[PDB]
Design a protein around this ligand. Structure first.
Ligand SMILES: N#Cc1cnc(NC(=O)NS(=O)(=O)c2cccc(OC(F)F)c2)cn1
Ligand SMILES: N#Cc1cnc(NC(=O)NS(=O)(=O)c2cccc(OC(F)F)c2)cn1
Ligand SMILES: N#Cc1cnc(NC(=O)NS(=O)(=O)c2cccc(OC(F)F)c2)cn1
Ligand SMILES: N#Cc1cnc(NC(=O)NS(=O)(=O)c2cccc(OC(F)F)c2)cn1
Lengths: 317, 319, 317, 318
């Protein structure tokens, strides 16, 4: 019995009997993702090349304008803007949205998979909205998700009711629910990290990886996959199980990925799917941020694999 | 001045004044690639999920390539990753070319929306015998043309011939491949290495030492970055665009490698060499291996020439 | 400030605070119209012609299944089915839907514009659902509209708030609001009917057309257009003004077009746009039907032209 | 056995063993038709309406012009959109003259009526330097002609010496699929098509011919009437279902309404290759020798029996 993103979202709103802002917000995000997907696939490229005689900027403008027109937001934090964007009073609603409009776009020259990431928080006070209102821990997320522009376009959406996966049918521009209440494998067989920073790894990381290549219980060594695009590496981790690591290195002693609009939403998706997401010292979702662009080290995926890493990490004090 | 695949392919034929079969061959191939992309992007998936009340993708892709190539009247022997024996084209549809292809490489992991691709290489039939499986048992040196289509964030067709390597982007709005990169050449030296390091305990010692040099450079220069998508077309195109090295080498458990020579290694090796790169098995150029079985495997190290030459020095130092 | 069908529909529902079923119904119909459009434009025809080794039936199946899966319907009347379709109990909602899934498809061989027509009623009694629940006069319509699959695809939606026109952007599969609260011209310059049947015309019809071709005063004769597809002829009348006629004659005393899923929805659109729609004897929206497939004569369009028509019709009565 | 426009056009050239210019021209034209169809269907309209914060017939003209020029197969271009003929620059000059209407019917695209593209191709006949004179050839000299209809689906109809063939565009994969080979019009149809709002201006022959279609003297069934208002749509219906299409002269248009070079001549060429007829009343459309690239002409066309029945009434009226 077919179900679409629009129908799904409205039905969650009907059950909850909320004010409707979250529903309008997600519909706005839905439209922007379809417009980003069409541009990522290079629709209209022939006009650029003279048939009749930017991409990360356009994605940011799409998300920004669609979110403002939802009447559901008051503060917007993007990977693309230095300071938080404050919505003008006439378009202001109560939700705070942090997003990376096109993560991995550094390498789109080689047609690597890219994606969009978002996290939605509720503003708690009646004070005037400000950049501080986006300094909330991940635990406060109302909803989070990502769109992956891979071989097909897929939207993964996490709320309290669980994680659901929608495939974009480009023939009719509709998102079709194809995976309900997704749960990650208890243990995977793939680890994912840039091993080129091996000289700089913390000893816990170096040892954890060595166990993956030379298992102490005499099982099969893990395979390694590292696309270099965060959305792709995490989505594969969700689908197949396993582990993804972006630990601290010398260029990034607090890690490289951004807490507000990369780490937290992915951790929210992981935890809602029965996986885990840790910095090494605490859950990603428990870090209290002090800067909207602050970084975080991240280890996430199947819970047996993350717990195995935490045991190596704790053994190294 | 805008240029399309259809126009480009036709202009190459006019310059050469050939029989036209190769031009029809590429036209058929182009149509098949556009149909694979539309299905890889899941156009029509809503019908599978009951919007109005079914072949797996790699089966559909093989059916598209096989049917378009036969209908071109330009081929006589077809070798696919999907069939144990060669397909011999029936007489009324026969032309003079032998085509080896992998219709949807990487589809084992398409469940996670990883980049996938189509790879092809084209040879001319060499003997006066009846066409047979023997006719595809040619070395890569004999390739007339080869290339790949990558279904990544966008769809791109990379086509290599004697004139060099040219890259075409599919405009999905109008279904045209637009020429966007003419006469592409790989960087002389890169900063990325690509291989599955999870199988490190099985590596040949030469591979183990080379990987150590990329992570721990002896001259105190920058260590390389690593990428491994796991889809061959995706990793090779990244190597073509950014430079660096891709390895699927021999080890003691797999003395002839894992990848297939006729429809993976050779076409990728031809594109590399026409773009100024290198492709070796360790012992010889990939394009010089003479196959004995249409599905035989080969180890492959390819990419920027400086990175590959430095690899061969470690491999030789391990006499 | 950009506006989509999804956003429009949700905002009208928030203002009204209904139970949400009509919003889910309109969302389902939107998905059906996009799927019909993709099939009408022949996406996938290369597979029918053997690249890898009806249309109105498919349209009826898309509408039926999208409407049934909406949980908002209990009786469905389609031009394609002999009997009313009763929705199964677990999927039953409160709305009755009458529709023609692919109007004009008799002539789709020549790529003429075709269309979808629908009208939405609220079930009035608590009796078990039956064909009777669709036997309501057009005055009881909650909403109505049509989709035109012409050179572009457009959805025209009429409610109490008025008539709004949405253009389908096929690049992203979104309906974009392009014409808000549309109103027809007081008087037009085009008449539309099949003149090949002049030998069978009622005499009032013959004189009315003669005044349009040989005006008794010193004005310009009207132009004539007749596409043969009701949706296209009615949309042009809506946009340019004028008059559309499928009148009664002596061989067809009730006209040829069907009342429940052609005349009533189109008449409802006309009246919300400030136009008029008559059988000759009464307003189309006032006819009380006794059979779900009964025919009705319909003259509709600009009010001055319809009133001039009724003036000739009374002279011959 | 599946067949595409690209495959079709190349096989026709291989049979003929020409210089290749005509094949490159039709390949360009194909691309332009796919791009126009994409714009006619309003792909990207959400960006115009502010989703991120040329007129359709001008864009259509720039697509055909640019695609044709870059083909290296043309030397003179006549468009409905340009007052004077376009002379291709020398580095890109080929031997063909092309007459086209980039977006026929766009006056009424406001209501999403079917629109279309019409083209006609001649070989340049004289040896002088290219000029507007080179497009003043009679329709008889056409090498190829056709039209694209942007209707409920997009279809390209192409007529050559080998006949008339119809290709449906599959928008999923941007390919023209051959669906109707060697098309022939019915000997006699049952539909007539014209704007009857000009009845007060009709010459007596048109008035009598029409009167016969509504009140047949043989007490047989009256014809049905259809009039879309877009020439490509009305002519395509006439080709597919049979019948007759008329746009005769009126007081607003004493030399007719439609243009001879890029509307009448191509449609007449298609009619004649499908076994139909096309006349002005005085002569076959394809026999008129034009004197101006934008000159108008009256046209009666369609099933051969229906046109001859019209010519018989036309003769009866001196
Ligand atoms: N927050 C929140 C919230 C609260 N109430 C809602 N109620 C409905 O949507 N109700 S309704 O479907 O009966 C309806 C009635 C009138 C018009 C209408 O127009 C639409 F179909 F165009 C839909 C929706 N959201
Ligand atoms: N091998 C090979 C080969 C050799 N010669 C070729 N010659 C042409 O294509 N010539 S042509 O373009 O002048 C041409 C002439 C007649 C009809 C025609 O129909 C087409 F437009 F549809 C095209 C083509 N391929
Ligand atoms: N009839 C009717 C009717 C009445 N109230 C409605 N209220 C909302 O949609 N409220 S909400 O946006 O706060 C919301 C809260 C919780 C979950 C949620 O789902 C998410 F997917 F969007 C949306 C909707 N329909
Ligand atoms: N007029 C005309 C005319 C005359 N000769 C023609 N000859 C061919 O097309 N020959 S060929 O197909 O063997 C061929 C040979 C070399 C390269 C090639 O590259 C293409 F496949 F990329 C194709 C074509 N048109």
């Amino acid at each position: 019995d077919v179900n679409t993103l629009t129908r799904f979202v409205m039905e969650e709103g009907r059950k909850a009997r909320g004010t409707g802002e979250l529903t309008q917000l997600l519909n706005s995000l839905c439209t922007a993702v379809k417009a980003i997907s069409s541009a990522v696939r290079k629709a209209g490229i022939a006009h650029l090349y003279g048939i009749a005689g930017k991409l990360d900027v356009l994605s940011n403008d799409l998300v920004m304008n669609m979110l403002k027109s939802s009447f559901a937001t008051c503060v917007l934090v993007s990977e693309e803007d230095k300071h938080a964007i404050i919505v003008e009073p006439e378009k202001r609603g109560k939700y705070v949205v942090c997003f990376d409009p096109l993560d991995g776009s550094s390498n789109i020259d080689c047609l690597v998979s890219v994606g969009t990431i978002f996290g939605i928080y509720r503003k708690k006070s009646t004070d005037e909205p400000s950049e501080k209102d986006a300094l909330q821990p991940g635990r406060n997320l109302v909803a989070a998700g990502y769109a992956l522009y891979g071989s097909a376009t897929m939207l993964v959406l996490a709320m309290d009711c669980g994680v659901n996966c929608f495939m974009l049918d480009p023939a009719i521009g509709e998102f079709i629910l194809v995976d309900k209440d997704v749960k990650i494998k208890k243990k995977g067989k793939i680890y994912s990290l840039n091993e080129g920073y091996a000289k700089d790894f913390d000893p816990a990381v170096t040892e954890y990886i060595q166990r993956k290549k030379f298992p102490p219980d005499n099982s099969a060594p893990y395979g390694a996959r590292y696309v270099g695009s965060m959305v792709a590496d995490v989505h594969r981790t969700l689908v197949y199980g396993g582990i993804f690591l972006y630990p601290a290195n010398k260029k990034s002693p607090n890690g490289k990925l951004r807490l507000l609009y990369e780490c937290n939403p992915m951790a929210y998706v992981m935890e809602k799917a029965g996986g885990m997401a840790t910095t090494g010292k605490e859950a990603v979702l428990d870090v209290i941020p002090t800067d909207i662009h602050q970084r975080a080290p991240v280890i996430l995926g199947s819970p047996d694999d993350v717990l195995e890493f935490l045991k190596v990490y704790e053994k190294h004090s």
